[PDB]
Design a protein around this nucleic acid. Structure first.
Lengths: 53, 117, 89, 195, 61, 203
RNA sequence: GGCGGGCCUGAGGCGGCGGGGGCGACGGGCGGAACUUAAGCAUAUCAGUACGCCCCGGAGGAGAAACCAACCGGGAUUCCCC
């Protein structure tokens, strides 16, 4: 989710904030960007069950 | 999965209503000094113990006794645990014959669980 | 080590699996090895070993056999088997 | 003429070339015996003696299928098929017969697909004492038994009426074929000048 | 065409080498799969044992 | 009492008689094609240990494999990267030339399914192997019970997958017991079983 | 040299029948990385992974000991807990 798109960072000195960007220059691959991957993705690998003796 | 296997296991039971799903296997001394005293379910009664009971190798498999020609009798005491085991099964077994008699077969107690634990 | 220490190891009688009716090459296997040896002949590595024996005695003959066959037990047997041909000519 | 310089297809050339390489090489003796077989008149006089026995014809095999096998419900016996002294063929059978010693004349063939198949039969013949002969073509030895090709044909007990002729045939082979003389041959490599 | 299909079927019927369109459709695997009976077929030496020691219904209390 | 004797004659391949017949045969296969159809199994006895029988539907094909240490292919013979992986002249093939010979005859003849391979002749420059192949479609093969299991789709192009003989040795199956625990189903499969991380929910 | 037959290795044509390509998983065989980690880097490590290639199945692979064990011993494989 979110990592599907392709973005190579535009990089400093081009006046763009430094964030991975698409061909036009749209925010991608960042929690603060629209459409980016939530930085810490939720997980199906959780301790769903809490055992009792 | 537990349910899947349970349902599948009971389907096996009705495909053969007379015979218990798991066959009788022999008690075998657990290996290594730590496990010498306890005995365990084993692959198969050896051909020697089976001939002590008096059954040919093929006949035993038909009756549900598994015969593994790999195991060697080894200890004489191993012959003792297994030959009596086979004995306690051959008495506790009722073999339906005469083609198929329907009413008698319908009242069959299938032994769910491993035989002669 | 690889054995536990029970001074009185042995509380159950033991039957020894043995021999399994220990067999032999039997008449045919040896006869055939004669039939082929008669027509095809001896291999070159063997010829060198036999020729070593008429002049040199053992030592270097075993050394050629270890290199050619790769194990001393096979070699000791080969040097000995080959020697039977050596004491005639 | 223009015939000598004709470029033949590769298969024809390779099969011709193998014969030339074979005649000019060392030719160890065990293979040399196969290269030179018994004389044609002698082959005729053993081949003529094979025709008098031999198994049934292919049409006779069909005749047995239609009557001997199909109508057996009307009858009952299974081996009314010929039971006459017969030449057998095939290396597995021949070797068991030669090792048994029951066989009298082994007629092995000079050409083979792998020479390894009947290389060790001549020695077997002199170890159990069986008289043996090498004759021309596995195919014209196959015809004797009616199969497509036979490596070897074994004369058997033989009919007594043919026994006087058989004894003359055996004696002629006994001079022409000798196992030990043949083992001291080591073949030949006749060169281009000799041709 | 429906009339045409049946008329051809009668002509090429109960015969080896039928025209492909008529042959049953199946899936590619079924067309090339072994017949069930041949799969059941066992070497005759292996078969004798099955009859000699056949299945017997038995029960243990 | 017959094929036994050929096996013995095949126990001495340095003897004069077994060298001469070897010269003739290896010379000829050098003046012949890489995958050539052979009507007769050149060695009749060995064929029956592998499984070949002379019923129709069985074909013997001879492959010629060149003998050499593998040379890795990279532009200008340099593997750009860390020093441990530099190497293009002495590598050794991980599939034996017998198995490669079996894969070879399978790519040029896909419909037939190869069984195992018997070595026929060899030289310094080129080795030769003959592989027995069985045609699944021919009727006799499907009906005969013993060879029927090959016709099952699961056993199609076994040679490439690794179900051949030198192939089972290539993965080390031919070595059973301790010392081979890590390759019992397959090495890539074994890696997953041990490395699998499973969290038991009710633990 | 010619001619005709048998065997054997081949050459075209015919008849029937197969074979090829596809699927973001699982599966089998190879060929095969580097970023990284070691606070540098060469052995290591990432990793017997990405990716490339060929092949099959509804599971495949594996499998009835040239096997573990050393015991008052087990007994094909496969999976799972430890």
């Amino acid at each position: 989710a979110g990592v599907q798109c392709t973005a190579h960072s535009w990089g400093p000195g081009r006046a763009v904030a430094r964030l991975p960007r698409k061909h036009g220059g749209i925010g991608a691959y960042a929690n603060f960007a629209r459409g980016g991957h939530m930085a810490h993705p939720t997980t199906v690998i959780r301790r769903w069950c809490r055992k009792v003796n | 999965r537990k349910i899947r296997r349970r349902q599948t296991r009971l389907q096996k039971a009705k495909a053969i209503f007379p015979c218990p799903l798991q066959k009788l296997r022999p008690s075998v001394t657990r290996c290594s000094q730590k496990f010498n005293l306890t005995q365990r379910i084993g692959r198969g009664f050896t051909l020697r113990e089976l001939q002590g009971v008096g059954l040919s190798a093929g006949k035993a498999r038909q009756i549900g006794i598994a015969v593994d020609p790999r195991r060697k009798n080894k200890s004489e005491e191993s012959v003792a645990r297994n030959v009596a085991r086979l004995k306690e099964y051959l008495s506790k077994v009722t073999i339906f014959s005469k083609q198929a008699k329907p009413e008698e077969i319908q009242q069959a107690i299938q032994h769910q669980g491993v035989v002669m634990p | 080590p690889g054995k536990v220490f029970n001074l009185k190891k042995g509380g159950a009688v033991v039957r020894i699996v043995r021999k399994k009716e220990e067999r032999k090459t039997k008449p045919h296997q040896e006869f055939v090895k004669s039939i082929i040896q008669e027509c095809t002949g001896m291999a070159p590595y063997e010829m060198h070993i036999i020729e070593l024996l008429r002049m040199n005695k053992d030592r270097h003959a075993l050394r050629y056999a270890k290199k050619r066959l790769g194990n001393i037990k096979r070699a000791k047997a080969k040097r000995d088997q080959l020697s039977v041909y050596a004491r005639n000519i | 003429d223009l015939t000598p310089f004709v470029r033949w297809p590769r298969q024809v050339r390779i099969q011709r070339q193998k014969a030339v390489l074979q005649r000019r090489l060392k030719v160890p003796p065990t293979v040399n015996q196969f290269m030179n077989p018994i004389s044609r008149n002698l082959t005729n006089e053993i081949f003529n003696l094979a025709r008098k026995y031999s198994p049934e014809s292919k049409e006779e095999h069909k005749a047995r299928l239609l009557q001997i096998a199909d109508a057996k419900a009307n009858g009952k016996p299974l081996p009314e098929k010929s039971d006459k002294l017969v030449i057998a063929s095939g290396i597995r059978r021949i070797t068991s017969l030669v090792e048994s010693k029951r066989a009298k004349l082994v007629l092995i063939a000079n050409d083979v697909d792998p020479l390894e198949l009947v290389l060790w039969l001549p020695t077997l013949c002199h170890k159990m004492g069986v008289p043996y002969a090498i004759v021309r073509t596995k195919g014209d030895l196959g015809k004797l038994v009616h199969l497509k090709k036979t490596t070897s044909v074994c004369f058997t007990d033989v009919n007594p009426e043919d026994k006087p002729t058989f004894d003359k045939i055996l004696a002629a082979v006994a001079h022409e074929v000798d196992y030990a003389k043949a083992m001291k041959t080591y073949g030949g490599g006749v060169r281009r000048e000799d041709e | 065409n429906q009339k045409a299909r049946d008329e051809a079927r009668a002509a090429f019927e109960g015969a080896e080498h039928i025209p492909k369109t008529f042959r049953p459709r199946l899936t590619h695997a079924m067309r090339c799969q072994l017949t069930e009976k041949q799969k059941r077929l066992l070497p005759s030496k292996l078969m004798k044992r099955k009859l000699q020691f056949p299945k017997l219904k038995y029960a243990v209390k | 009492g017959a094929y036994k004797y050929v096996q013995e004659l095949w126990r001495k391949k340095q003897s004069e008689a077994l060298h001469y017949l070897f010269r003739l045969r290896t010379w000829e296969y050098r003046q012949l094609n890489a995958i050539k159809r052979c009507s007769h199994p050149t060695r009749p006895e060995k064929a029956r240990r592998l499984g070949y029988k002379a019923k129709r539907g069985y074909v013997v094909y001879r492959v010629r494999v060149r003998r050499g240490g593998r040379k890795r292919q990279c532009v200008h013979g340099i593997s750009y990267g860390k020093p441990r992986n530099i190497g293009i002249v002495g590598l050794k093939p991980s599939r034996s030339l017998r198995a490669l010979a079996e894969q070879k005859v399978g790519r040029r003849l896909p419909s037939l399914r190869v069984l195992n391979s018997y070595w026929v002749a060899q030289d310094g420059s080129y080795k030769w192997y003959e592989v027995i192949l069985i045609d699944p479609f021919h009727p006799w093969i499907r009906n005969d019970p013993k060879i029927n299991w090959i016709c099952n789709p699961v056993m199609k192009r076994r040679e490439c997958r690794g179900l051949t003989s030198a192939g089972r040795k290539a993965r080390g199956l031919h070595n059973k017991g301790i010392g081979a625990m890590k390759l019992r189903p397959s090495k890539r499969a074994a890696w997953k079983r041990n490395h699998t991380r499973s969290l038991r929910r009710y633990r």
